[PDB]
Design a protein around this ligand. Structure first.
Ligand SMILES: [K+]
Ligand SMILES: [Mg+2]
Ligand SMILES: [Mg+2]
Lengths: 238, 247, 236, 234, 230, 240, 204, 233
């Protein structure tokens, strides 16, 4: 015990002598290979997702570089990690949500969608023939009774609802920032401030992406550059 | 895929089935379990391992399973594996009864299960079941019977036998004290307590720590009873009384 | 070693050793030559005899009236592939009442042979083909490989010591398009003869010829029927 | 379903899983068969003795049909499977041809079963050999043997199991017209052959008369009658 | 089409080490406690609650299976969720055939049997969880545990997860068979306090109860009240 | 590595080396480029001639996958051809189910998910190819997507794949492609291919050119012979 | 009609801490009597019986298939099946064959194995259950049986009066049905004993 | 450890090369093709006098006009022989004619390489067949002998030996073989050569011989007919 290994416990999802799944732990490291960080926060009126938009090239069509995804018209999502894995998990989420609506006659609750994706991830932690997906999904939406929601699930199949949360390279630093801020008794401002602190950047409007849902306007919306700029300008004048 | 495959159902270089042998080591460590054939009945006597703690005592026994009206069994080895096999025994017994409208002869039930166990050692690449079983019963072909099966899918009929902890030592004791053609349920019960008193190295043997079931005939009908704790204490006492005359 | 047994394991150099090893099967087969003119496609092949009393191995197989093949590598894989090709040609005549175009047949071989290069426990086909055909686009010589790749050729040679044939074919290929048929076969035979040890010669026992074109359904020539092509005899 | 090749060739042409199955046979109880003139006999070593065992439940000699039976050496569980499959097949033959099987027919069936398990994905070979005996419709007595490879042959007499080497050496020198002229001697030839390595279960099949098993009082008659003769021979 | 071969096999000493290693995941899991009272059953567990950022009410560890049966675990949460879904599905299948709620013992047998499958079936690992299952049927309370091997046991009281050996000796010198449910809740919470670290609130433990009225979770405000006196 | 034998195994640093090794097969391939402009997309490929016995045209690396979509490939050619068949089937089925030409973005995403599925399992290996998809229509404009062996898919103004990738990208970055036309860009695609071609290390190549734009009425087509030759001549003379 | 091919009749009836179940004894094929001791009531428990009328082959098959299921249930559970639970088990077995049914319409009579409360029910051939507090009938003379039961049945009958009523209901019913009768068997089920009688009955 | 369909660096399938090594452990068999018929002769290789020599069959009738001699792992040969039998009867059923020797050989040889472990239908073949075969028969091409090995390569042969002593036996066959050779000369030649290469002293019970002739159906020689030919020694 303490970093012990037997057999194939570093290669497939079997228990190590301590009771660990090294392959799952390695899927968490795969999340940081993308090099990006994402933050999400929930208020009484709205929920917001902000993530980095790195476009080093500019031979890229930057409209197609995004980690923000519409799942349904009322459910939005930010993906952190391996891109192709992420895209696949987005398809599955879309499929699960459409199917729920078809069978049950009402939009999937965000908590249920997250749970479902987590339960699917769980299968890859217990069956030896496939790897976990090296990605993390954060979902936002409005619930009719509970208000705005942010949910996250991970490659271990854990999931939770959050007041605010983060994913990727600066997760632990964003968590600390949000902890000290939430400890006291504006949601888009907090999210972009958190991200800008932990990266020490101070953004241009083309270097982030922002997604929102609000109690008034529950349709998932992606902000334009101009709309983001207006928030960046409003913060700059303290 | 080839890389990860244990290869559970292949021969070793000396013609051996390693997974079977290792299962048999698991059984060697499990709670001791014996059966004794008498003229007027059959018994099973087993060490309890669910013994005790803050445990609740909810079922009629821990390791004695009724299989049908005329048959019971006991198990030594992996408990969950035993639950799969005993459940399957019950099913085999009811399939026979459906088809013939008479009870499955004891040996046929054992054989049917042993074919399943054998198959797990020859195809499929799975681990075998880590279980040995003692079976007691009555049928109209051979009357009172006792059988033993093990993880290879091998079996045999016995007048007395033991599986589990200190088996070799128990079979010694039985070879000497067991009277072929001349045992009663009362003398076999005394012999059972004698052997369990030797083989449980957990020194001063107790009723809380053993289970006995008897199988007899009464009015053309098979009776299967798990002795209550008052009967088990009373028999331990008669074995403690009996040790002296020996002095 | 940990990268050379499975067709599903990429090496660190971006190679698949099982495919390369399948390609060695074809380098070890006896040589064959494929070439074409404006009007004909011809195959020429060296046949090996396991002993003096054995018959020489077939290297040239009929596929349809307008297609034949020459093989190098595992014979059993050659037969399985040739049977596949035959079937696709029959299907096409069944459905459309016209010959399957040669480039479409070659595509079908590519798809079919690529499949096992990507699945665990499967293996490449260990055979390389030269394919002679004639259709509306005229004569063709294609080459197929164990990698599932294929090539459209002015001429080609595969198998043992085929590099010598290739070198002859390059030297004279600017002549091929306007050769009459005898000239073209003479060219094939000379290219094939270059693969032979200095002592060894082309005989009626060891040469097999395949011809298709504008005037002629795919026809195979063995034994006494190759004699007209061998005399002939330019060399020295 | 388990598609692993289990029996494969090794570099010098060996099928090692089959050779290992053969090692399982060599650690089994010795079994002997002799083809007499108008009788056929099979006998087999101890098992364990063990005073507490029900003798009936561990016989290593088994009826396949009225006119064919077998003994085996090797893995007993594997043998039970082969035995039941052959029994099923005897009844199919009876069904579709309205004759009992020849001893050869069923020997051939058992052998091809065994051969299949050496050339099929997910299965190890059967760890047994079998001696198969009986009589055809025309009265000719028969002794056949099968092994894990699916090879089969006819024998005048033979052994399999532990110490088959020496027991076969004994039979080679001792099988003569004189030792099989009568039934008593044929039966004795088997018991002497076993006493060479060996208790002893034994059974006989007379032309038409179906399978008789002996009988521990009738057996130790022959035991003492050979044991005292191998003391005079010292 | 899967890996068909087992991933749990016997070692030379007769151990199934993938199960032993599953048990190690259980032993490093958060603590759980079950106590069978005379007139009820209590299940309690520690919520490993890092960060004030979690919404504590969003996911639960103590779960209803039916109106009369509930669950808690120690070990890996996502594995537990699988088993909660199967137990629920098993409970309904039973109800559809028999039109009677599934007896606690029957539910445990069926769930244990699913756990057994994952010790033998191709290409999978066992579950890294032990379950505690409470229920009320035949006018009487039940408490069961089911382990990664698929073995189950009926308990009067027990503990699992981190520090369980001590939890069990604590309960041993504290449980009696004639104890009421409100008192058993108190001692369950005390058993967790033995191995807590951090100071308890009603937002980082979870408690479920089972009696004649059925199974339910205690609310934050009910737990807060029991936490006065602790 | 430990660790690099199966796409179902993560390394301890969170990498999937079988996918990286497939990427290496592409990075050993000769270079293909795509450029999106004002009124279409143009593709060019450096096609190495491994033998003068091959026909001028053989081993095409530019494919029509629908009447409005071209595909440009680098890497293991049999894997690339099989991917062109998947793309073709996807576009064909799209038209059958929904009744119109598949939007390029949607075809790229669908084919990328297929490529992605070969990166999770021991049962299969990753594709050893990267490919670009190009189209033009009046409604959607010019679009150029690129997909690699991990199954990642992005839209581009300009793109290069294969061994002189980086060298090609720096030349492409010098173009104001947004304001230029296909008839102009062909010359520049040919020019860039001749620049990044290592004429010492691997002599002799054929240039392969195709386009899709207003000037082809939204059909993907080979660049005509006379225009290819003028672009070759421009490229060659710009080098000297 | 498929249900009149073999004929037959069963009924059950509730009393004070007791139940009764009865059946005719004829096995016949259309007009022909084959046997006069054919069993239609099967014990499912010490105090719990199922009577089946309908096509004789399915009477037997349903009884045997049900017993299979009950035997497993009792082995696996702690215990003897409750009446209401046997009803559900039968319902379930019949509705599995919803689109190719067994041609049998059972009645169940018993006492709870703990509380000894009386229980009766019947089911149709696809497993619709009907529980009543008085009586249930099934067979080719259902109308005849309803006439008798509806006129004779009273509440809270002791074992003796229950016997006379169920017997008179059956005997007079089947005597107006050509393909039921050739004898009647009656089981009275009490807490402490089972009483089984055959009745003196018309044999035409 | 590696799968049954792995290529070696030299471009051969390991399992097939290894199956070819198993043929070298088999008894020697000889075939000779003459204008008067073909003959097949095989060393039985008796391992004990207790064994019935006639229960060793290594030459088998395929159809009336075709025999088969085998060497290697004999049990493996059964499924191949059955398949040859069934194919010739299927051909007769459909076309009302006899199947050519070359066609029968071809059909059997198409089973060689049909083994594997993930494509895989039943529990279909897990490995190649450890057998070589000589098919000798008569069709309208005249008398004909073909050889097949575990690779699925098959070829016509004027004379051929297989099994342990085949190098030596083949060398002796090159020496004696001529095209105008009679069948009775070919029979004597093959017995002469088996005598040399066998570890046991040749006699009428430890070899088998069969012919197929234009006039005549497949014929296994009797003890008595063997004794006649053995006299010349
Ligand atoms: K996995
Ligand atoms: Mg009537
Ligand atoms: Mg009448």
């Amino acid at each position: 015990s303490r970093g012990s290994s037997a057999g194939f416990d570093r290669h497939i999802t079997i228990f190590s002598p301590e009771g660990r799944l090294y392959q799952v732990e390695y899927a968490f490291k795969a999340i940081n290979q993308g090099g990006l960080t994402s933050v999400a926060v929930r208020g009484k009126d709205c929920a917001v997702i902000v993530t980095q938009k790195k476009v080093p090239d500019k031979l890229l069509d930057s409209s197609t570089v995004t980690h923000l995804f519409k799942i349904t018209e009322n459910i939005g999502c930010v993906m952190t990690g391996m891109t192709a894995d992420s895209r696949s998990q987005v398809q599955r989420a879309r499929y699960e949500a459409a199917n729920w609506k078809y069978k049950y006659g009402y939009e999937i609750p965000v908590d249920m969608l997250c749970k479902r994706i987590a339960d699917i991830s769980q299968v890859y932690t217990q069956n030896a023939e496939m790897r976990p997906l090296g990605c993390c999904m954060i979902l936002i939406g409005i619930d009719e009774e509970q208000g705005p929601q942010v949910y996250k699930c991970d490659p271990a199949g854990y999931y939770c609802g959050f007041k605010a949360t983060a994913a990727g390279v600066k997760q632990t630093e964003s968590t600390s920032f949000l902890e000290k801020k939430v400890k006291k008794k504006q949601t888009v401002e907090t999210a972009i401030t958190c991200l800008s602190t932990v990266l020490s950047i101070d953004f241009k409007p083309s270097e982030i992406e922002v997604g929102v849902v609000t109690v008034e306007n529950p349709k998932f919306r992606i902000l334009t550059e101009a709309e983001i700029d207006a928030h960046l300008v409003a913060l700059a004048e303290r | 895929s080839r890389r990860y495959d244990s290869r559970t159902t292949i021969f070793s270089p000396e013609g051996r089935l390693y997974q079977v042998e290792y299962a048999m080591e698991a059984i060697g460590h499990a709670g001791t379990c014996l059966g004794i054939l008498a003229n007027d009945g059959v018994l099973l006597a087993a060490e309890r391992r669910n013994i005790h703690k803050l445990l609740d005592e909810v079922f009629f026994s821990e390791k004695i399973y009724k299989l049908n009206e005329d048959m019971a069994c006991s198990v030594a080895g992996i408990t969950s594996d035993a639950n799969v096999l005993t459940n399957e025994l019950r099913l085999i017994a009811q399939r026979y009864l459906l088809q013939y409208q008479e009870p499955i002869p004891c040996e046929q039930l054992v054989t049917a299960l042993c074919d399943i166990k054998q198959a797990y050692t020859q195809f499929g690449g799975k681990r075998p079941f880590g279980v040995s079983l003692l079976y007691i019963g009555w049928d109209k072909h051979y009357g009172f019977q006792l059988y033993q099966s093990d993880p290879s899918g091998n079996y045999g009929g016995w007048k007395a036998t033991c599986i589990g902890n200190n088996s070799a030592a128990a079979v010694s004791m039985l070879k000497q004290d067991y009277k072929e053609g001349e045992m009663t349920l009362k003398s076999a019960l005394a012999l059972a307590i004698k052997v369990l008193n030797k083989t449980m190295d957990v020194s001063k043997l107790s009723a809380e720590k053993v289970e006995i079931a008897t199988l007899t005939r009464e009015n053309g009908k098979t009776v299967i009873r798990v002795l209550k704790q008052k009967e088990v204490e009373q028999l331990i006492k008669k074995h403690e009384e009996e040790e002296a005359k020996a002095e | 070693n940990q990268y050379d047994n499975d067709v599903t394991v990429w090496s660190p150099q971006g190679r698949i050793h099982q495919i390369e090893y399948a390609m060695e099967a074809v380098k070890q087969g006896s040589a064959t030559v494929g070439l074409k003119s404006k009007t004909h496609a011809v195959l020429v092949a060296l046949k090996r005899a396991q002993s003096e009393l054995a018959a020489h191995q077939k290297k040239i197989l009929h596929v349809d009236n307008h297609i034949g093949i020459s093989i190098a590598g595992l014979t059993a894989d050659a037969r399985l592939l040739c049977n596949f090709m035959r079937q696709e040609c029959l299907d096409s005549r069944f459905v459309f009442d016209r010959p399957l175009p040669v480039s479409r047949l070659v595509s079908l071989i590519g798809s079919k042979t690529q499949i096992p290069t990507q699945r665990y426990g499967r293996r490449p086909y260990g055979v390389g083909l030269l394919i002679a055909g004639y259709d509306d686009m005229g004569p063709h010589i294609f080459q197929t490989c164990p990698s599932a790749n294929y090539f459209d050729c002015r001429a080609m040679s595969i198998g043992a010591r085929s590099q010598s044939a290739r070198t002859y074919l390059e030297r004279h290929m600017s002549e091929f398009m306007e050769c009459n048929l005898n000239e073209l076969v003479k060219h094939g035979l000379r290219a094939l003869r270059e693969t032979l040890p200095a002592e060894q010669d082309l005989t009626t026992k060891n040469v097999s010829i395949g011809i298709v074109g504008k005037d002629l359904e795919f026809t195979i020539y063995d034994d006494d029927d190759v004699s007209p092509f061998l005399e002939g005899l330019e060399e020295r | 379903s388990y598609d692993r090749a289990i029996t494969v060739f090794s570099p010098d042409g060996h099928l090692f899983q089959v050779e290992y199955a053969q090692e399982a046979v060599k650690k089994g109880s010795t079994a002997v068969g002799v083809r007499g003139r108008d009788i056929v006999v099979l006998g087999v070593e101890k098992k364990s003795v063990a005073k507490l065992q029900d003798e009936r439940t561990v016989r290593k000699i088994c009826a396949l049909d009225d006119n064919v039976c077998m003994a085996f050496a090797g893995l007993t569980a594997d043998a039970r499977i082969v035995i039941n499959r052959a029994r099923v097949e005897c009844q199919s033959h009876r069904l579709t041809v309205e004759d009992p099987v020849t001893v050869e027919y069923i020997t051939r069936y058992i052998a091809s079963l065994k051969q299949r398990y050496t050339q099929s994905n997910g299965r190890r070979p059967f760890g047994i050999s079998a001696l198969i005996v009986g009589f055809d419709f025309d009265g000719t007595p028969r002794l056949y043997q099968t092994d894990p490879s699916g090879t089969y042959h006819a024998w005048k007499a033979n052994a399999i199991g532990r110490g088959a080497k020496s027991v076969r050496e004994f039979l080679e020198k001792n099988y003569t017209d004189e030792a099989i002229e009568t039934d008593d001697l044929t039966i004795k030839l088997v018991i002497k052959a076993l006493l060479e390595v060996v208790n002893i279960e034994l059974a006989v099949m007379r032309r038409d008369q179906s399978l008789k098993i002996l009988n521990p009082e009738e057996i130790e008659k022959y035991v003492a009658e050979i044991e005292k003769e191998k003391e005079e021979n010292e | 089409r899967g890996y068909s071969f087992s991933l749990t096999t016997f070692s030379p000493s007769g151990k199934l080490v993938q199960i032993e290693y599953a048990l190690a995941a259980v032993a490093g899991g958060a603590p759980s406690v079950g106590i069978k009272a005379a007139n009820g059953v209590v299940l309690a567990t520690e919520k490993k609650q890092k960060s004030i950022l979690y919404d504590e009410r969003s996911v639960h560890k103590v779960e209803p299976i039916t109106k009369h049966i509930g669950l808690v675990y120690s070990g890996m949460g996502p594995d537990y969720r699988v088993l909660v879904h199967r137990a629920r599905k098993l409970a309904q299948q039973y109800y559809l055939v028999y039109q009677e709620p599934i007896p606690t013992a029957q539910l445990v047998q069926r769930v244990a049997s699913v756990m057994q499958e994952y010790t033998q079936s191709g290409g999978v690992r066992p579950f890294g969880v032990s379950l505690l299952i409470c229920g009320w049927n035949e006018g009487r309370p039940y408490l069961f545990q089911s382990d990664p091997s698929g073995a189950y046991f009926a308990w009067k009281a027990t503990a699992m997860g981190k520090n369980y050996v001590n939890g069990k000796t604590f309960l041993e010198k504290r449980y009696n068979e004639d104890l009421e449910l409100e008192d058993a809740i108190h001692t369950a919470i005390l058993t967790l306090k033995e191995s807590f670290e951090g100071q308890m609130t009603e937002d980082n433990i979870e408690v479920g109860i089972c009696n004649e009225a059925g199974f339910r979770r205690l609310t934050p405000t009910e737990v807060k009240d029991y936490l006065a006196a602790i | 590595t430990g660790y690099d034998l199966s796409a179902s195994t993560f390394s301890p640093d969170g990498r999937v080396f079988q996918v990286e090794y497939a990427m290496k097969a592409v990075e050993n391939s000769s270079t293909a480029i795509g450029i999106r402009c004002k009124d279409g997309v143009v593709f060019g490929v450096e096609k190495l001639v491994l033998s003068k016995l091959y026909e001028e045209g053989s081993n095409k690396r530019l494919f029509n996958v629908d009447r409005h979509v071209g595909m440009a490939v680098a890497g293991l050619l049999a894997d690339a051809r099989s991917l062109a068949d998947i793309a073709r089937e996807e576009a064909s089925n799209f038209r059958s189910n929904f009744g119109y030409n598949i939007p390029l973005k949607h075809l790229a995403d669908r084919v990328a998910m297929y490529v992605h599925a070969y990166t999770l399992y021991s049962a299969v290996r990753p594709f050893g190819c990267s490919f670009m998809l190009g189209s033009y229509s009046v409604n959607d404009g010019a679009q150029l997507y690129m997909i690699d062996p991990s199954g990642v898919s992005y839209g581009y103004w300009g793109c290069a794949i294969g061994k002189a990738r980086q060298a090609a990208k720096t030349e492409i970055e010098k173009l104001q492609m947004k304001e230029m036309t296909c008839r102009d860009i062909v010359k520049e695609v040919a020019k860039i291919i001749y620049i990044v071609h290592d004429e010492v290390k691997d002599k002799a190549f054929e240039l392969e050119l195709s386009w899709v734009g207003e000037l082809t009425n939204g059909r993907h087509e080979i660049v005509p012979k006379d225009i290819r030759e003028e672009a070759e001549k421009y490229a060659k003379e710009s080098l000297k | 009609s498929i249900m009149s091919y073999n004929g037959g009749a069963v009924m059950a009836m509730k009393g004070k801490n007791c139940v009764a179940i009865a059946a005719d004894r004829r096995f016949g094929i259309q007009a022909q009597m084959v046997t006069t001791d054919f069993q239609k009531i099967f014990p499912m428990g010490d105090r719990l019986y199922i009577g089946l009328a309908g096509l004789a082959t399915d009477v037997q098959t349903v009884a045997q298939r049900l017993k299979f299921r009950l035997n497993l249930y009792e082995l696996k559970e702690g215990r003897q099946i409750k009446p209401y639970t046997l009803m559900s088990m039968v319902a379930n077995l019949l509705y599995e064959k919803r689109f190719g049914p067994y041609y049998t319409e059972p009645v169940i009579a018993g006492l709870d194995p703990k509380t000894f409360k009386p229980f009766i029910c019947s089911l149709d051939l696809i497993g619709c259950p009907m529980v009543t507090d008085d009586f249930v009938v099934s067979g080719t003379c259902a109308e005849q049986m309803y006439g008798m039961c509806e006129s004779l049945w009273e509440p809270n009958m002791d074992p003796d009066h229950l016997f006379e009523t169920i017997s008179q209901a059956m005997l007079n019913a089947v005597d107006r049905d050509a393909v039921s009768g050739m004898g009647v068997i009656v089981h009275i089920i009490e807490k402490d004993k089972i009483t089984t009688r055959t009745l003196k009955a018309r044999m035409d | 450890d590696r799968g049954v369909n792995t290529f070696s660096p030299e471009g051969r399938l390991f399992q097939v090369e290894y199956a070819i090594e198993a043929i070298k452990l088999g008894s020697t068999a000889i075939g000779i093709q003459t204008s008067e018929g073909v003959c097949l002769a095989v060393e039985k290789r008796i391992t004990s006098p207790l064994m019935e020599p006639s229960s060793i069959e290594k030459i088998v009738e395929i159809d009336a006009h075709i025999g088969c001699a085998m060497s290697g792992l004999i049990a493996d040969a059964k499924t191949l022989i059955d398949k040859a039998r069934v194919e010739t009867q299927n051909h007769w059923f459909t076309y009302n004619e006899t199947m050519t020797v070359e066609s029968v050989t071809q059909a059997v040889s198409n089973l060689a390489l049909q083994f594997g472990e993930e494509d895989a239908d039943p529990g279909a073949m897990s490995r190649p067949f450890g057998v070589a075969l000589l098919f000798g028969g008569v069709d309208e091409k005249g008398p004909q002998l073909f050889h097949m090995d575990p690779s699925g390569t098959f070829v016509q042969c004027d004379a051929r030996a297989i099994g342990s002593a085949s190098e030596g036996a083949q060398s002796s066959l090159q020496e004696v073989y001529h095209k105008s050779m009679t069948l009775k000369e070919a029979i004597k030649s093959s017995l002469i050569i088996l005598k040399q290469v066998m570890e046991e002293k040749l006699n009428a019970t430890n070899i088998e011989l069969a012919t197929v002739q234009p006039g005549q159906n497949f014929h296994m020689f009797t003890k008595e007919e063997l004794e006649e030919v053995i006299k010349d020694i």
